[PDB]
Design a binder for this molecule. Sequence first.
Ligand SMILES: O=C(O)c1ccc(NS(=O)(=O)c2ccc(N3C(=O)c4ccccc4C3=O)cc2)cc1
Ligand SMILES: O=C(O)c1ccc(NS(=O)(=O)c2ccc(N3C(=O)c4ccccc4C3=O)cc2)cc1
Lengths: 255, 255, 269, 269, 238, 60, 56, 56
Amino acid sequence: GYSDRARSITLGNSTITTQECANVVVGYGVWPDYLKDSEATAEDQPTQPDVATCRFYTLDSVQWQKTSPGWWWKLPDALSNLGLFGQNMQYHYLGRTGYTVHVQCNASKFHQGCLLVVCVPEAEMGCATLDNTPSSAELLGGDTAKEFADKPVASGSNKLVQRVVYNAGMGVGVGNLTIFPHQWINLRTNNSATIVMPYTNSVPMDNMFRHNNVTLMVIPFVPLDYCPGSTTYVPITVTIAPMCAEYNGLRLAGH
Amino acid sequence: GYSDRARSITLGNSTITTQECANVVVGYGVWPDYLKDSEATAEDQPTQPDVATCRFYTLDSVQWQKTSPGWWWKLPDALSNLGLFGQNMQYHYLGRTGYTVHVQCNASKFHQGCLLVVCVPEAEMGCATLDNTPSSAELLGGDTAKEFADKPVASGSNKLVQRVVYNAGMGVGVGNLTIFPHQWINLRTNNSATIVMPYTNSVPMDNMFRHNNVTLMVIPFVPLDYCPGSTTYVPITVTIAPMCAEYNGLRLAGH
Amino acid sequence: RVADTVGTGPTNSEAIPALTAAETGHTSQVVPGDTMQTRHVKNYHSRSESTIENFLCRSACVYFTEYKNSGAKRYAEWVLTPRQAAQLRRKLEFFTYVRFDLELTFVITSTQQPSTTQNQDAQILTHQIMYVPPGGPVPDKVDSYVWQTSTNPSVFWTEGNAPPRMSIPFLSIGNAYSNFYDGWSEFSRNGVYGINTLNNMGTLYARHVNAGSTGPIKSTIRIYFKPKHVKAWIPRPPRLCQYEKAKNVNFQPSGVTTTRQSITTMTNT
Amino acid sequence: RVADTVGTGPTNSEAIPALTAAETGHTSQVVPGDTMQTRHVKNYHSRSESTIENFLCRSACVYFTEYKNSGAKRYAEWVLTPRQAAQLRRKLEFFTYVRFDLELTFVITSTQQPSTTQNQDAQILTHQIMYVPPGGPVPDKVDSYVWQTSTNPSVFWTEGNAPPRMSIPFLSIGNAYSNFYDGWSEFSRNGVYGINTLNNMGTLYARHVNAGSTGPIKSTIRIYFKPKHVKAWIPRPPRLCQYEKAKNVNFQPSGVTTTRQSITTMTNT
Amino acid sequence: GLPTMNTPGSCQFLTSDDFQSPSAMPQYDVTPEMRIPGEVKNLMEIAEVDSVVPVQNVGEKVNSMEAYQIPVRSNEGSGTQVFGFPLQPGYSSVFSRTLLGEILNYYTHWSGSIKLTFMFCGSAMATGKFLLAYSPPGAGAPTKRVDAMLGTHVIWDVGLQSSCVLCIPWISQTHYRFVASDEYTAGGFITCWYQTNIVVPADAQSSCYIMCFVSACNDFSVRLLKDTPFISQQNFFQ
Amino acid sequence: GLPTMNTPGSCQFLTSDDFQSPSAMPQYDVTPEMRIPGEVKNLMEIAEVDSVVPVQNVGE
Amino acid sequence: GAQVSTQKTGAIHYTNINYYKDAASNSANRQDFTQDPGKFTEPVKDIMIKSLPALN
Amino acid sequence: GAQVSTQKTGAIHYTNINYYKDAASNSANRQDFTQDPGKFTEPVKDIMIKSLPALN
Ligand SMILES: O=C(O)c1ccc(NS(=O)(=O)c2ccc(N3C(=O)c4ccccc4C3=O)cc2)cc1
Ligand SMILES: O=C(O)c1ccc(NS(=O)(=O)c2ccc(N3C(=O)c4ccccc4C3=O)cc2)cc1
């Protein structure tokens, strides 16, 4: 209907409308749907959270500086605090999810900059120490944005993650991250990215409080830039919504 | 129609008629035609020079002495000066051509002599120095006839071509050159040779200002001979006409 | 069999198949015809030697160990992983999930070791390569009851014949081998990182059956893997920076490209 | 199956199938019947063992190199060209363009080298012949990562068995291999002359897998080429003067024929 | 007895063979099959996706996010060169680490068109026109816009749809080309020139950026597999 | 097992043999075919062409 | 039964009979030609048609 | 299928079955008999008929 600048994604109670943007990028060509009986490995009865764990959970906003390295938020561990998603993953052994990762950032028409919004499934990060693994408090968020750096993280005995924008903390060239579903938030025109992740794993259902199946990375390829004066604080706000959640094996609260 | 002494080849504007000669020798059995889509390697759109690059370009005349070694003219590099053929090969990366090589030489009926007119595709000449390659200014013409010699070219550090009539500057016996399409210009009777070359290469189209697909060689097997007096200057004039020219990849002027 | 070009000609209408935002995460398909005019060109080129399987199905050496026939280490041991050779590893790490069968070929070659032993004469060493499934028994001394191969597969190969070959089917707890695992094995998120039990096909031990020559002989078992019946899902960036560890993705930061001169130079340094 | 003669008889009409100018570049076909009379003779002779393929499809040795199993040159290297042997080369240079598949057979034979080393005993050397496609990696030290044969084909051959054989298909950028190239690779017409990239199937390296005997052993890899599925276009004169270089047609002038006595002598000198 | 004579070719192991085999544990029941999203069945699925080209290089414009951005600025004289690199993927130090080029280094041959999408990431009021030209090998790269015109060019007029695809068509004298450097075949020169200088109003930054993306076309094929040179190891990973 | 007894003739390499073979890179797609002029299919095509005989010989 | 299929030709027939009990011991499926770039390329919800601009 | 063809006799039958995936690994085409000397011999435009002189 008319212009494609408009979009409106209603999931449950919360709606995200955007005045101006572009197309929604759908997964690898699959939209998250429930797991059928010919893939169901669980023998127990699953719950149906429906609309009450499919609302757009608005994670922490982070401020984009004129020159800023980039950010990443793990996916089952950014929602391990918010709402009933954070409950269910803890009371249930197995969980299965899809996402609507919607990154929204506005800017004036005198500002320029360009974010790459990718969603890397299975981002296994390296480490500054070449024989130690990361910690679980540097590697993961807490719904907070972890940010990289533009200089190598110095080696020692530290278990801090290796964080360099250009290697993406994985040891792959940053410019090749575009294979994975993504979109760009070029501030010239297009002010949001919508990436619909379908459930991707080697097993049909997996624990979410020990395994992080998706990692969102928002990397500015063209630094934010403008003239003197104006506004100097253009945040990037992430709204993520679980989609087609399904759990099994009703244990008890844990870690 | 009547006598076969007559022939008349009209290509575009220029016509070559000959009062007396013999049959036209057609290629290997193929007459040059345009390259079809099942051979077209180029993805670009080719030009059609038509009649304006299909006229008989009359190259340099050379004087046949009583005893003279022989001559050769490279084919895409004898026409790299004359007319629009010399332009097109320089503005276009790829080119494809056929030829009508018509060697004309007249003589009186008190003169004798006999030329072999062959067209050697891919004449890769040796060198006087047995470890150096030829130069590009001795090896090639400039539309001028390069002539061989009857004594071996002395070795040194020189990059001058090895030129001996009897080895044809290739290291093959001169008497075996007749496989290739040819004709004889026996001055007794028959005063021209017409050899219709079709495009011959391993690739469908190739640059012409770096590769010379045909080499015309005119070798006198029976020296010109006559009695004292009369005329003493029987030239050999070469008229070559491109046939079914086609170019691609409209670059800019080069070498 | 690839696609073909077709005749076009001039264009002056509002079509502009060129101009289109690439900000939408959509990689547009533009043919020659759109930016110029190109006649009908038939292409017979074949995009076969580029299939996922054919790419991965090439035997690559994953490892090799040495074992003296008379001394200390009379047996070698290897936990099966393709993560010991850079070459094969980088090909597998071009996909997040892969599923395949393996063909294990072992190229065992013996070399005499310098010694002052008198009258050294070999009587054709016979080698035993034994596969021990994950959670099997573990041999120590080379004479242990473990080497009886009661249920454990083994190839017995007499030297000077076609190299031993055996197949392994797809053995994974899951439904695909994970080439990248983000997660721990422990619920408290400590310990090993991405050392998940899905790509751990037990151990493979090898030893000399006989006592060979009187003198010492050292043999070199070279292991070859060849992926048959491959299915690969989720493509991902090839590794840039060099590998550092055989179970981690640890790396030292390095260049983004090979450097040259200016932005307008036409020749690589 | 060749043609047959048929009865003729006297001829007194204006036919003269003999007299005809050969100045027109037309090689006339004259039978026995035209210059005499010959009755009907049936010929069952067969012009098969003269076909283009059968002519060229004979295995010819193109080269051989040597490599010590313990010392310096532990590997040999060869840029594939048929231009290293006079015999095969002259047959190929009877055609301007040829297209074919290759069958590479390697006849590796080992010879012990004299030494004062004590108790030299071989344990069946295994040789590796590896094909490196054009623009591949180049091994240096014989232990380089290059020899992992990650994608590069290799034949592993244990000594004392049928010699290794492998096929190569037709690999050419163009649509035929050029046996004679008149042109340069450089647009300024300098540098190499007729060193075109169409007959350059990379390099082939070979080495000893094992450490063989305690003493030195030198092995000799002999390479055999055999053209299958041959198609040959544009015939041309066979080479007269001897070859001088493996990439040029350089020559020293020599005789046009072997000499004899007079023009009317009936016996060769 | 069935008479047979072993042809030479037997008793060898190739590193690219394919045959029947004896099994290990026989009758093993393989796990089921899941239809996990994003199945790959051909390398051309991966090769036809855009990847950012790190066109800029200096010596520290190859260790940051400065590599991927191509500096564009308003210069009063028009005919200035924006960038320039040869098209010779899998050898050129501009495409040596891109997604297309990295797949290409496992192959010796390649054929097909290549798409260079240039995306203007300037201000939203900045304008400019660029003459993106590809000049086939026939001479040694233009040094003026007046020479670049003669080639196959596309004038890109900016203003909404912040990308414009200059599609480089197949111009070669052969049905394949080498990935590794050769001089029998070459790939010409890709240059960009200002057609009409970057006009930027007040309060808008006068230095913008362009991004270059490399992708394969659908008329693309690679042939003859070899193994990469851009990966290495010394001792085994312990 | 299919009983066979190797007849003598096996385990040799002739220089004029002809057999099936294992391929190198499998599934390689050979380049197209052009109908380049002057195809040769028999040596009698070449042998039935005139060549000048150097009948005279002396020493120069 | 004997499965007969054309050899991979550029521009014929080989018998092949599986001889082993398992189906994990059969020769590789080198021939298996399929292409479907509507996945990673153009993953968008509503396909952009090449005749107008993607955005309004 | 099995291709049966006569052995090259002077003046019978052999089974041959291609066993390899590629068609570049099949045995040579030793039998392939054709002759057509209307090429290099007599390449003239208008064929000279043997009953009169070529020239007038
Ligand atoms: O290879 C295995 O299957 C095999 C090898 C060692 C093995 N371990 S054991 O149970 O400790 C064992 C250890 C030694 C012997 N053993 C001897 O001590 C001996 C002395 C003289 C002749 C024979 C033998 C002989 O077998 C038998 C069994 C089991 C099986
Ligand atoms: O053949 C190849 O595939 C192969 C040979 C050498 C090679 N190059 S390397 O990456 O420099 C390398 C160099 C040496 C070793 N290596 C050792 O240093 C060693 C010591 C003791 C036991 C085994 C080994 C062993 O493999 C492994 C790799 C790669 C592969």
